[PDB]
Subunit: 334 residues, 3 copies
Amino acid sequence: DLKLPRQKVELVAPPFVHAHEQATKQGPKIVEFKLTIEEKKVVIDEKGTTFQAMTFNGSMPGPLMVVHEGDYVETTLVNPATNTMPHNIDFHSATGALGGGALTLINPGEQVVLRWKATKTGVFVYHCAPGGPMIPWHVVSGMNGAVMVLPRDGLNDGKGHALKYDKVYYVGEQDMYVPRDEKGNFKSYDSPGEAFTDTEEMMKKLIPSHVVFNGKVGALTGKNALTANVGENVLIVHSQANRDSRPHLIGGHGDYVWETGKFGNAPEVGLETWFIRGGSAGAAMYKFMQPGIYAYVTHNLIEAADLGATAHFKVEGKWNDDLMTQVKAPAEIP
Amino acid sequence: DLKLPRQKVELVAPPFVHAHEQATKQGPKIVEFKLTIEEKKVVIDEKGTTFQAMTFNGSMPGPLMVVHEGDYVETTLVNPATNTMPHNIDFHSATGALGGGALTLINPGEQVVLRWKATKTGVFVYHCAPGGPMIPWHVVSGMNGAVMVLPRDGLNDGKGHALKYDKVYYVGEQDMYVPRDEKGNFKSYDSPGEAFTDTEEMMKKLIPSHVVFNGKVGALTGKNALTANVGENVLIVHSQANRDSRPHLIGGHGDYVWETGKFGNAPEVGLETWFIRGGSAGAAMYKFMQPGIYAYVTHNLIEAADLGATAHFKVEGKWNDDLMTQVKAPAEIP
Amino acid sequence: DLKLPRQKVELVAPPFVHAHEQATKQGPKIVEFKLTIEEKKVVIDEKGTTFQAMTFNGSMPGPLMVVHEGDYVETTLVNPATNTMPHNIDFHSATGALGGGALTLINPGEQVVLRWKATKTGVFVYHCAPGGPMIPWHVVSGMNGAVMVLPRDGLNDGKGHALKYDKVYYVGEQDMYVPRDEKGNFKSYDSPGEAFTDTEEMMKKLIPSHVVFNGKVGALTGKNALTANVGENVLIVHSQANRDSRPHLIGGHGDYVWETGKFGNAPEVGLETWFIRGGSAGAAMYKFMQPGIYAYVTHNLIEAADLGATAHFKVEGKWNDDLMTQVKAPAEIP
Ligand SMILES: OC[C@H]1O[C@@](CO)(O[C@H]2O[C@H](CO)[C@@H](O)[C@H](O)[C@H]2O)[C@@H](O)[C@@H]1O
Ligand SMILES: OC[C@H]1O[C@@](CO)(O[C@H]2O[C@H](CO)[C@@H](O)[C@H](O)[C@H]2O)[C@@H](O)[C@@H]1O
Ligand SMILES: OC[C@H]1O[C@@](CO)(O[C@H]2O[C@H](CO)[C@@H](O)[C@H](O)[C@H]2O)[C@@H](O)[C@@H]1O
Ligand SMILES: O=N[O-]
Ligand SMILES: O=N[O-]
Ligand SMILES: O=N[O-]
Ligand SMILES: [Cu+2]
Ligand SMILES: [Cu+2]
Ligand SMILES: [Cu+2]
Ligand SMILES: [Cu+2]
Ligand SMILES: [Cu+2]
Ligand SMILES: [Cu+2]
């Protein structure tokens, strides 16, 4: 019925994003994506705490999918027989059938193919949502990512000027609920099913044990710091499928920010901290002015420093003494 | 002194809203409303947990009051002798005297009549606020609702175009604090006064036991699902008098959203999830494009699925395969 | 190198703000400020609970610094030898070096001088951030304040009209974490270092024991109520360095509100409640229309009434019966 050109995308693991055009002369296409569910025990902190994760494509978050307004997104969702539970997918970008969830419930050993038209621009969450109490559990176990639906003319500032990024990163924040035993040590479990009772009891108290970017404390640090150069315009897409977050670039700003994440609305300018509503993605762009280390955090600083929610940028370039200078180094008080 | 026409309104129980005009050729009127306080033990979940509720007009939330900018709202507040506590009313829409609270404190057996001019457009909370520690307790016991103050020309998109809804629903979200005994079972109490000590101790820890729409788990489901048809523009007014919420229509969008709830500001467009600040009401409109079941949730999914904060819409009409289609049903992996 | 005129500012304790111009014919200057760190045990509630505070200039919050866009802000930070810990300062308004923190780490007995150019307009947090787990601890111990960077033409409504305030107040909200002993009584400690272990364990659970304005329950009440007169336009700057807040003026409104706090964006109009993201400052202006007592709260009413987060305004002037009137005083029900 639908006779449009087909284009396959090779998804890449976060925080990177598959290659795409911003402004495009292409017309609508059917863009084809594949997600393969993986349930797996992973390590989430530098002390070796383990977690029963459930993921799209083996990562937390799931990969960022990028399309343009009016494209048709055709996803093959695969639930291999090596998994234990049914799963599905719900796209906040899509219209009808609970975002697709009512059409994609698959048991281990099955796959399904869903197509939806990208009628709404912005960044959007996608997540598993099998039904009932399983919905929060699968999401907070890691089964969420995001999609970005660009205008065909690319981004603008609302005020007819184009806003072109040099690079884009996707920072998926995950609230995790790991129960503790009587000693006060984090518990380990042999299966997601076995983790369920204790994990649900903790979840209902609403306080996470960990809040992490890219699946683990320190994931986006050291060798895996985010990078930029002075003069580069970087777009940071930030999602949180269950709980609020308040992103902040320490030493920088959000030059243009869509905190509700939707490109039909003009961005706000010159923010210090912005707010990602639980169940949403937002986006912020910043042109780096200074070299050095920056930290990208949620600005609940307890969560950032003590629960895991800190990434770093390492930025190359020349220091600008007009913008900031140490007039007098630390010295004894006169 | 004030010589304007008087109009009586028959309030209706949420989620329905009393009949009103959007755009009107009427001039200012004195619009007359009556609220009768009822303290009552109610059931809040499908397991039979009870709660000592305090309500305006017998409902949680209290009913939605609808007027137009420049009307005078004249409320008779009635506290029958069958109640145990003093009560009052504070309207966020009103100016002076703590929103009216300083002029409406009434003991059991008394009534009072307050008039305020509707100078600010939008949706606003109203709530009881007797003084001191009683303020949070009365609010989280159920004593809150909302008022909607429409422009006389009706709603607009900010961009000179009219925005007319086919129907309006009021979803009042309530955070409830029910203490547990040593066993781990929810406690029942013989009076609001007897529930006070244990309830205050829990309240100060800031974690609700239940988060519900329209007073109970499952209230807006089954026979009491919200309804629409494909092609209908529905306005959903959402209030939360004490705690933040993040509304989301699963399978839909907020086509036009006033998340801070005030019609002097243009709506945002094409949202996935929006944010209702504790102590406020907001409003979102959506034109349904697909038939079927939708869930309307706060997108803290633990609260939605496990604590009570889910409503359903049942929508009639024709499925649109252009917008979404199951290209291949669940099948064994090749 | 930088040859501009120098101007010294005498900082004043919150909620007051040092004298400044709104619109100015001055060009860029180097504006000189001094902050002296003080670690001190203070009383935070009317029951006599004590707290190991860490402050800029002896106050919580630290004082508001006011400059204009394109000024250079030169701060001398002083850490006297009477303190026990290293400290630094990070300005969200500044660009590079973690907001200045990477250039201002000072041991007891040292001082440092930092200059930054005020390229971004709005209200911004400043806070200490020494590194690692110390970052949240120093902030929630009191080491935060705000700076306001005004346009040189003063404030505007976005719609070419000027917005001039008659007075400005700075309300700094502090979430505090005071542990309890087995009895259930709040603990007292002999030093910040001794309070650290118990305080960090509580902090990671994310629930404060107290939420206060200006450092203490009841600080901005009685003799220290905020004041205004009918007809006065008051700007209220509100900051929260770690945790969200939802300000509300009971009996009033936010006539013009920058809830993300940045003057490059037009204000929203006619709000009931606004939202300050943890790690940010915002600002709201209101022209008083009625005399009497107003309460300024966070509209989590449990926090406001039970945890400490209430200020009062006492307003002088003539009551306006058109806006609100008690039509019939409390009487027996007919
Ligand atoms: O940035 C979106 C914002 O900008 C405005 C102009 O104020 O419209 C621009 O963006 C639209 C969506 O990309 C374009 O269709 C339009 O042509 C362009 O002017 C606003 O209408 C919009 O909210
Ligand atoms: O939607 C409100 C938003 O729209 C604007 C136009 O951009 O003004 C419209 O709405 C006002 C309030 O209803 C009307 O008085 C006005 O005539 C109309 O253009 C904005 O000014 C406003 O913020
Ligand atoms: O209030 C800021 C908001 O107003 C606009 C006009 O809609 O610009 C005004 O404010 C700018 C910043 O102060 C001035 O430079 C400009 O000249 C003035 O019109 C918007 O552009 C801005 O977002
Ligand atoms: O599953 N580990 O690559
Ligand atoms: O009070 N029950 O209808
Ligand atoms: O330290 N007291 O003024
Ligand atoms: Cu799943
Ligand atoms: Cu969802
Ligand atoms: Cu009451
Ligand atoms: Cu209120
Ligand atoms: Cu410090
Ligand atoms: Cu900071």
